[PDB]
Amino acid sequence: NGLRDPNTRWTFPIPYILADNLGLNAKGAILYAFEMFRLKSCVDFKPYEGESSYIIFQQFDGCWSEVGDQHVGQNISIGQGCAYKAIIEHEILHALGFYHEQSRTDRDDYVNIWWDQILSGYQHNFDTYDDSLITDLNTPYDYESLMHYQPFSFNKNASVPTITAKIPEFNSIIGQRLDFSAIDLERLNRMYNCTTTHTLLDHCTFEKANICGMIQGTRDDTDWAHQDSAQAGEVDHTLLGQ
Amino acid sequence: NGLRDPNTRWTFPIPYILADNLGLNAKGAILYAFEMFRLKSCVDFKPYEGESSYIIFQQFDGCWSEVGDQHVGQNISIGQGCAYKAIIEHEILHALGFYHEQSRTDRDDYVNIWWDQILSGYQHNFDTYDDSLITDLNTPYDYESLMHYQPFSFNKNASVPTITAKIPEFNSIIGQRLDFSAIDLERLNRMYNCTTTHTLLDHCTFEKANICGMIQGTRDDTDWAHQDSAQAGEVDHTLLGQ
Amino acid sequence: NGLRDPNTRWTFPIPYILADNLGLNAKGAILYAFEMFRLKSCVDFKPYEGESSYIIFQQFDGCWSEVGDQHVGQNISIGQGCAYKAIIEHEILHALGFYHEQSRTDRDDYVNIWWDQILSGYQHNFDTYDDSLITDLNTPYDYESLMHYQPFSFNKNASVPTITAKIPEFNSIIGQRLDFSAIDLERLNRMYNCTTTHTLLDHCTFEKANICGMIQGTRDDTDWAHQDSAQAGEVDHTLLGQCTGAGYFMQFSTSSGSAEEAALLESRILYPKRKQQCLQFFYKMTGSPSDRLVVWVRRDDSTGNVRKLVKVQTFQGDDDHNWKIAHVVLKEEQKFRYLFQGTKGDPQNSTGGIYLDDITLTETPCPTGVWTVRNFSQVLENTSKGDKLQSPRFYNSEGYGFGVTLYPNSRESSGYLRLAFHVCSGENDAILEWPVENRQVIITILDQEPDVRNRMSSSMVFTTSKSHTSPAINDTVIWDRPSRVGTYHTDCNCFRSIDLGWSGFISHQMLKRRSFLKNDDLIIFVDFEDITHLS
Amino acid sequence: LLSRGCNDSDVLAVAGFALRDINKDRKDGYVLRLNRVNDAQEYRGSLFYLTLDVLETDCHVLRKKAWQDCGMRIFFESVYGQCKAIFYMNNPSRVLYLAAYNCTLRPVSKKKIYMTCPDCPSSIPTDSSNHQVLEAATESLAKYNNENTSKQYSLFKVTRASSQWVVGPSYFVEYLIKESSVPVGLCKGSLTRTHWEKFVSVTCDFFGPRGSVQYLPDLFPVHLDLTTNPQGETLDISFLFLEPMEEKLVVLPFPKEAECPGPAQNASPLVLPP
Ligand SMILES: *[C@@H]1O[C@H](CO[C@@H]2O[C@@H](C)[C@@H](O)[C@@H](O)[C@@H]2O)[C@@H](O[C@@H]2O[C@H](CO)[C@@H](O[C@@H]3O[C@H](CO)[C@@H](O)[C@H](O)[C@@H]3O)[C@H](O)[C@H]2NC(C)=O)[C@H](O)[C@H]1NC(C)=O
Ligand SMILES: *[C@@H]1O[C@H](CO)[C@@H](O[C@@H]2O[C@H](CO)[C@@H](O[C@@H]3O[C@H](CO)[C@@H](O)[C@H](O)[C@H]3NC(C)=O)[C@H](O)[C@H]2NC(C)=O)[C@H](O)[C@H]1NC(C)=O
Ligand SMILES: *[C@@H]1O[C@H](CO)[C@@H](O[C@@H]2O[C@H](CO)[C@@H](O[C@@H]3O[C@H](CO)[C@@H](O)[C@H](O)[C@H]3NC(C)=O)[C@H](O)[C@H]2NC(C)=O)[C@H](O)[C@H]1NC(C)=O
Ligand SMILES: *[C@@H]1O[C@H](CO)[C@@H](O[C@@H]2O[C@H](CO)[C@@H](O[C@@H]3O[C@H](CO)[C@@H](O)[C@H](O)[C@H]3NC(C)=O)[C@H](O)[C@H]2NC(C)=O)[C@H](O)[C@H]1NC(C)=O
Ligand SMILES: *[C@@H]1O[C@H](CO)[C@@H](O[C@@H]2O[C@H](CO)[C@@H](O)[C@H](O)[C@H]2NC(C)=O)[C@H](O)[C@H]1NC(C)=O
Ligand SMILES: *[C@@H]1O[C@H](CO)[C@@H](O[C@@H]2O[C@H](CO)[C@@H](O)[C@H](O)[C@H]2NC(C)=O)[C@H](O)[C@H]1NC(C)=O
Ligand SMILES: *[C@@H]1O[C@H](CO)[C@@H](O[C@@H]2O[C@H](CO)[C@@H](O)[C@H](O)[C@H]2NC(C)=O)[C@H](O)[C@H]1NC(C)=O
Ligand SMILES: *[C@@H]1O[C@H](CO)[C@@H](O[C@@H]2O[C@H](CO)[C@@H](O)[C@H](O)[C@H]2NC(C)=O)[C@H](O)[C@H]1NC(C)=O
Ligand SMILES: *[C@@H]1O[C@H](CO)[C@@H](O[C@@H]2O[C@H](CO)[C@@H](O)[C@H](O)[C@H]2NC(C)=O)[C@H](O)[C@H]1NC(C)=O
Ligand SMILES: *[C@@H]1O[C@H](CO)[C@@H](O)[C@H](O)[C@H]1NC(C)=O
Ligand SMILES: [Ca+2]
Ligand SMILES: [Ca+2]
Ligand SMILES: [Ca+2]
Ligand SMILES: [Ca+2]
Ligand SMILES: [Zn+2]
Ligand SMILES: [Zn+2]
């Protein structure tokens, strides 16, 4: 679902303005979304200093972004309730050249669109783009994607889903608003050549015998066992003896 | 173990020459090693066509490389007996700005060097470098590294190792020459901003209910089950009931 | 005693080099002396970066300087045994432009030189200089000057002084090596046009009704009284009832009202020049144990508005009701205000309150351990020679446990106080490197004056070292792990090392002067920090 | 003496003949190459005291090639240093004559080589106590004695040697030979002992003014004071001529080292005197 043309790619840090029409709750939610980007990708943000393109975030009507870097600098809107971190993250993924997951070229292999159940005047929000416009980034269609729309989106009747997964399990999943999915990060990283997150400094689960390059001191008396999770109650926290 | 200065980086594909002093076996093995780079990383190689920096591969005395891009273009030696892919990969990792693993700044935390067992005049081959010359790329010391020297490296006595792991199990593993380690690929990717690789087009292990973006036909009769390994005697191949 | 020619003045910060022929102990003591200049004057120092004139500090024969800026750059020697801050300060005053005080043009009006008692070939070190070489900076002759010479200076016979004051009392005072004198700082300020100093950020004794530009909260419940020392039995710490109508302090009564009522006393805004500060103050908590004195910061929220509250340290009531000393490490890098909340706790069980006086705020580390000894004059009479007191166990920033032994009456000499450091076993020892290879002890007998420029705190410095050993521990290092090498004390459930320090750290007849025993009690500061990074 | 700029064109010409004469005297080791004139000071034809900063070529002195016919050594192989010399040139008689010299040489810093290229064969202190060097030279010779049998050859002396350990022990050697009396050639060779299989290689190539040479160990001290006399001390060069021209000469104490130094043939600090 990424915009193919490499000119549409930002160059980090994306300079940003927060407009003063934003509530405090929306300004703080934006900066919290930036921390998630910086924490899960090489995407970075800076305050504005006269750059040619930049995001201005706004409390305009609705919650929306142009897709990819418009080289004049661009609005994003964050209307009421879009203060939720995941909705900021979704709009910033549009700003980072990403279309909705149900707008993939291959989307019809994965999701039904119930055109008959869409509100008249809103069927075009389920358009799909050709592969000259968008890459797959060599990724599968992801139901867990933050870019996906939930089942009850643009529907005539509140009880009837506009969009459903052809693998029927995923009806209970599509359009999650938790966070980026693992494939949304995999895509974002393929799009921006990100190999290292700005804030994940280290992590370790000891699954490997080099213990994540920890060492044991010699000034101390003794050593910690690297323990195999095999004993009757003494399981690890990563796998819980699974 | 990466050469910090970003001026020392290549720009892919690396243009290369195979000199005719290479035996046919050595030419063929070098191309096989490039296919491993192209398969495990975004590193690529092209035949030389007039570029300012390039690698020339030659059968000189022994098997060696300058470290990082020398902008005038540079020799890799692959002397007689160095034809195995892992040795070529090790030398190409030197040309790609890597030092040996036991030359990391922190190496003394992870390996013992038995200085008195090193042959006289060969102590320098165990010189560490400071953090001004080299990055860890925010990665642990990796005993399984291809760059790591074998326990018997420059040793006086063929029964006695020069270098041993402070975690004694890794005595048996230091200086593996199978392949790139997982962390050597991680470091190469963090060095050269890789995420994809040129020659892995897809893979699937089914561990995710998404089934790797596979879909099931409807002009066929039935469906493949996404079968759970929980049923007795009926495990998957990825984990084999582990 | 200042060199008249203005071409001999430095321009700050003085660029410096510490030569590697200096011991670590000397390198640390020189930096500590620079901190005392920055804490009492507008003198400042910097690492050398290729400047024309500079000081290189070295460990040559003896301890000396050229006088004033030599424009090509100049040596200071701190020969072995010269480590103590006052000697370093004396030689840095020579480099700043000051001659010895007994070399003043008018000296003979103030001192006797017993020339026949001087060693032959040393009498020229007692020459007096004319008014064309030197200014008085319009200051009197100062017997308390650090630039003065001890009675026993270059003398033939160890029983006989070379130099005595014409006013015979000052025989007991000449050549003090505590610190800069008040007049030495006034001269230094008059030479270099100083008014501020880099490392005293604020102080308050509440003497003016202005309360040092402190204010009171209005979002709190009530107020601290700006309380007069004239009320019987309720003296402030600045004057302790020594003057009528002039002792003032803040008091927050907890004897009436509800529990958890509070008052904020809040400073004027401060613009820190360093990343760390130490808020010293004196306080009492005579009210119910459940009373709380809570120290807070209000700091710039980064919009330039000083509104971000940060609770930093809570002081709680104890059986002691006399004036305690507090130090709170602040870590402020943006403009701020230090705040005291008092919290009423069970007024039905309070006959008293919380009190504050003698606040001082320095842009320094805090003393790593602080010991008070109460009724010290009464202790000093009651104690036999070679009896001891031991401090409770402090921990340094690295987690080494340590303490000090005070021997109020030295067995090594009559009328001297002996004071010595030791490492203590503590909850961290198992992981710390042993021996204590390069940690630098600074012990100070605090001079209790709020204004740091009015303080002549006696201080002695050593660095725990591999050379420090005894046959009492089979000739092993004193600073090895105290469970191995020290002696046990149920007195704190600790091991303690063999102690090292000074017999006659200070004489009793010196300690009774100034503010070292201000509330008839002694205050000792200890620092014990690694100086390996100076190597 | 008229000190001469290190880039002075007559000095630049003189240096190439002086170096050729220095090689002409050398009866063992390798042909030296100019890196750059670093001193030249002239007594008055013209008598020059000199310091030449120098490299080692890939040719042994017993090989019949002139120094200009030869190549420079690769960075990791490098030997370099200073030659101090005394040389005379008579413009009317076209005379070109080295009188004396002293040359101090070092291998390149084994550390700085490892810093530039980690697997580069590090050079060995040359002696028979390195049994693996003897094994390498005898194996490469034994291979050549099987590659040809029209003649057979014997190891005369091992000259230059390096080793490496990236595939197990790999040794590289250069040595003199004669038949199975004076040498006939220089041979390069190698031995690489992987646990499962040896590898062996070989090449074979086939074939004064008072001074001194030393190959010192790495991390330039030199002496050439032929007199102490401040007035100078006598020399004679009159033997150069078919007719008895009066050509006695003077040596004064050796001159101590703005148009200086000369430009380097290889500017790398790996092969540059301080
Ligand atoms: C009421 O407060 C008193 C102490 O406070 C003082 O008395 C009030 C009535 C007011 O006049 C206050 O302004 C004034 O400061 C509390 O008494 C203290 O109780 C504690 C705990 O039982 C005692 O601590 C012990 O002390 C011994 C040494 O004597 C130690 O060995 C123990 O380890 C432990 O620390 C303390 O001695 C005692 N102090 C006095 C002066 O009596 C009282 O408990 C409190 N009442 C309530 C209901 O909170
Ligand atoms: C993420 O990494 C990509 C490589 O994996 C980068 O892709 C390369 O970007 C180059 C420009 O920066 C492209 O060069 C252009 O190539 C076309 C022909 O394809 C020429 O017409 C252009 O003149 C040429 N531009 C210049 C200035 O020479 C590379 O072709 C391109 N390579 C590939 C495989 O796409 C991405 O730029 C990089 N993205 C980010 C945001 O880091
Ligand atoms: C891998 O990705 C990195 C970003 O995550 C790239 O690093 C950036 O490369 C820029 C050049 O392409 C650097 O800009 C230059 O910075 C220097 C100072 O370091 C300035 O003097 C130059 O003026 C400036 N260039 C211009 C045109 O002004 C960035 O500084 C640098 N950023 C960081 C954080 O390192 C790597 O280049 C890239 N490497 C590879 C092998 O792909
Ligand atoms: C502390 O305050 C002093 C004043 O109370 C300063 O003294 C003044 O310094 C000036 C230079 O900064 C002097 O000007 C020079 O005077 C000499 C004759 O003394 C002339 O030859 C020079 O031409 C003149 N300079 C110029 C540029 O013309 C003042 O004369 C001098 N005033 C007095 C009364 O001495 C101290 O310099 C100052 N100390 C510091 C460290 O700032
Ligand atoms: C929304 O959709 C539901 C399901 O299609 C409709 O619910 C049915 O309505 C009929 C009457 O028209 C009832 O007899 C059925 O019992 C209902 N089914 C259920 C599951 O409750 C509903 O009418 C639709 N509403 C609108 C406004 O379109
Ligand atoms: C090489 O190392 C081995 C192993 O340490 C040495 O073997 C010892 O040899 C002596 C006799 O020379 C025996 O008494 C010991 O029992 C052997 N030790 C072991 C552990 O087997 C060997 O001598 C060494 N050789 C050299 C040349 O260093
Ligand atoms: C500081 O004192 C030292 C010791 O005399 C000076 O160091 C050497 O002194 C002798 C005599 O001046 C000279 O021959 C050496 O050349 C000096 N060496 C150096 C490194 O200076 C030193 O010059 C004095 N002054 C300073 C500014 O360092
Ligand atoms: C140092 O000064 C003292 C005080 O004048 C001298 O003390 C006298 O010493 C002699 C014995 O040598 C005694 O007989 C006197 O009674 C002492 N006098 C007093 C007042 O105690 C001492 O001799 C002097 N020493 C020197 C070397 O000059
Ligand atoms: C790669 O190694 C070869 C080893 O032969 C280098 O080539 C020699 O370089 C020197 C100095 O330029 C010349 O004197 C020799 O004549 C060269 N020999 C050959 C066979 O060409 C070469 O310079 C090295 N570097 C590169 C980038 O090729
Ligand atoms: C100190 O002296 C007072 C009398 O002024 C006495 O009541 C008090 O108990 C003494 N305190 C100590 C600790 O000796
Ligand atoms: Ca341990
Ligand atoms: Ca099907
Ligand atoms: Ca007061
Ligand atoms: Ca109030
Ligand atoms: Zn002095
Ligand atoms: Zn290598």
Numbering used by the authors:
A (entry chain B), B (entry chain D): 66 to 307
C (entry chain E): 66 to 600
D (entry chain A): 31 to 74, 79 to 214, 231 to 257, 299 to 310, 324 to 361, 366 to 382
Article, verbatim:
Molecular docking analysis of fetuin-B to the meprin α oligomer instead suggests a compact, intercalated packing is possible that is not impacted by the helical rise of meprin α. Indeed, this structure confirms the intricate packing suggested by the molecular docking analysis, albeit with some degree of flexibility. The presence of a conserved interface suggests the oligomeric nature of meprin α confers a selection pressure on fetuin-B and supports the notion that meprin α oligomers exist in vivo. Indeed, structural studies of human fetuin-B in complex with meprin α are consistent with crystal structures of murine fetuin-B and meprin β73.
In normal tissue homeostasis meprin α performs key roles in inflammation, immunity, and extracellular matrix remodelling. In contrast to meprin β, meprin α is secreted into the extracellular space, whereupon it oligomerises to form giant assemblies and is the largest extracellular protease identified to date (~6 MDa). Here, using cryo-electron microscopy, we determine the high-resolution structure of the zymogen and mature form of meprin α, as well as the structure of the active form in complex with a prototype small molecule inhibitor and human fetuin-B. Our data reveal that meprin α forms a giant, flexible, left-handed helical assembly of roughly 22 nm in diameter.
